[PDB]
Amino acid sequence: VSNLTVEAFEGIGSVNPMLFYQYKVTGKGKYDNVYKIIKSARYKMHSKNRFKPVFIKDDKLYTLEKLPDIEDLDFANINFVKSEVLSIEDNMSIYGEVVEYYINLKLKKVKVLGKYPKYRINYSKEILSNTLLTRELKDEFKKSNKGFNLKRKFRISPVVNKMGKVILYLSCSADFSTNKNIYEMLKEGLEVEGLAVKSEWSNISGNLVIESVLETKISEPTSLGQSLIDYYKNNNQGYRVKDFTDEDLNANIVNVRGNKKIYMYIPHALKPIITREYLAKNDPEFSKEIEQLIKMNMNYRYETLKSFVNDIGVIEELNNLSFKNKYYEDVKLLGYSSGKIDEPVLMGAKGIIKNKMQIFSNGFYKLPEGKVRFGVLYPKEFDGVSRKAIRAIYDFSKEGKYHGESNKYIAEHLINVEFNPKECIFEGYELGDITEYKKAALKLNNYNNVDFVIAIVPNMSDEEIENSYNPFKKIWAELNLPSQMISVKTAEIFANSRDNTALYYLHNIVLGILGKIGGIPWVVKDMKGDVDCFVGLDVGTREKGIHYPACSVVFDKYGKLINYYKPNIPQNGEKINTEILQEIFDKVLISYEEENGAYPKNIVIHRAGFSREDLDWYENYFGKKNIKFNIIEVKKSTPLKIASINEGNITNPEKGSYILRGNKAYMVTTDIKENLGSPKPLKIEKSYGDIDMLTALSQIYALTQIHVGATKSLRLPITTGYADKICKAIEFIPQGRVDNRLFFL
């Protein structure tokens, strides 16, 4: 079979315990403690003397070689204390920082094509290689004709163990930069407005974006208080203001919004964050070229890391520190335990389905009792194309026929819909202001003959006249009428095309079409392990000071959605209170008693982004009600990636394979073939439980495979994934009361 590994290179040799220098910082300046400026004074001292290292442990600063004791620094003066050999087995993070520093210092001295150093390094974990590595193993600069440049931000993070071995964890991440500035684009007259720009001089954190431009030169005193070049002289930045010439004295001021105030900077400073928005809108053939190189299978970034640690080579400063260029054989050598989870059995109306497409051909497992009466919004210029699209979706859902022709791959009466084209409601709406969208949605929903909305919206692209998607979704979720929507690209795909590449669109339309009205398309025949329900939670933190409240959901040992419940009382901060948990678990016991007449004997509580506190509430609250319970936290977005070795030639891993260490389980849930990227796996953590992670991850993978609004599987499990969707869609959900119909799908 195909085993799995992880982006790790074992350092050949051993890190020996070396002679360091204990430094202490004296509280000279206005700062009371030396803790909050130990990073600041750290990189100041590092900037002092030929870029020599300095490391941070809570009170003792370590340097490897004897720096001369300087006290000329204005806020802080430091003091040498003693010099001794520090033990590696007590100092893990310190010698890890030593190894990352020395591989930085060895990669600085490497040049490619003679003049050009390969890696621009600021002595951190981010090693930006100026020179790419391509598909055909050519380490070549790839620049655009328009000034764009791809680079690949290596992320080292080596850790050392108690014996002395250092393991270099890596992460390829192709980043985006340009040699141009916004002044150079002003020289060819490119429009600077609408540009997410990044100050490489001021390292403030904020979405800096261009405000405007008037005609004042930079050699004139402005609203900052003076001529800004004098403040560049004032900010200990003479080496960057000494350079620019008399034509650059004719630079025109371009101001920038750093999300709290205006900033008046020179345009020779500011460089645009050239996102894929920018690469597409300004040179799209460059984007079509580079998606072979930023969407990247395991073979390609393994080739890159092979080149990377081939370029590191060996370091004699750490006693023959060399790195292997091959991955591991298995993660058992690293500490985890691999394995593959078998696929879940899925059933529909007449029992088992072979694959996730057969449910249209045989029938759905859980239909809601009643009839689903459609109603369609569409653009007024796009009448007949929408007519053919709605005729296609209704013929598919009711009559089992596709563009009139009946076909054996689709069962009849798949959803009990009631849609008569001579009798039902069509409302053409013109693409205009958003209040026209509001009056169109209420002019549909005033008539109580509709149970489901199919709006035809414009595409997610197409900046001119914009989406009617989000105000429609807000109104149809607030009016308690679920809606599945169509971008008009898909409408002419239904009308004009004559092949199955509108039928696949139609498959995901029908799965969403039954998910929105509370039906469940398929379930498991059995969820592994003794279990009666699932509980998924999440909290959201989009910006600073914003804590989205909790959202709960319940499933069963079939995994059908019984209920998703929003708690009523608002929380306090990131970590939630106890009354929210009280009402959530009282209501989840009420809902499971409502749907099965008994209490749960097992409960697997899935969880997104909580800490291990509040667990005593779970302990006493389920000791009073004496159900054995399980709490498993699902970690959504990890920088950790996953590989798969086929006889030394390594590629993407198949879906359903996990790697596990105790309570730490990484698992890839999705299948991605090559030239499309590499699958970004999950991370699974158990805070309290009596179950092994085998049946836990089997539940995890089965609830990846029961996404109820698409033919292909979701990456997240649908407990924490659907709770995460509701925590995204916090204003779509009705507040405080129970519901079955999935709005977000």
Place this chain on the structure above:
DNA sequence: TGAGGTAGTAGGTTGTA
């Protein structure tokens, strides 16, 4: 938004070592 995945890029907290 068909629909999910990848990827980027910006931006914040705070948990476990």
Place this chain on the structure above:
DNA sequence: TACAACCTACTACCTCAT
């Protein structure tokens, strides 16, 4: 205390075959 993981938002392609 730090700080590496964790979150979050938005686009761009790309393929879906029973």
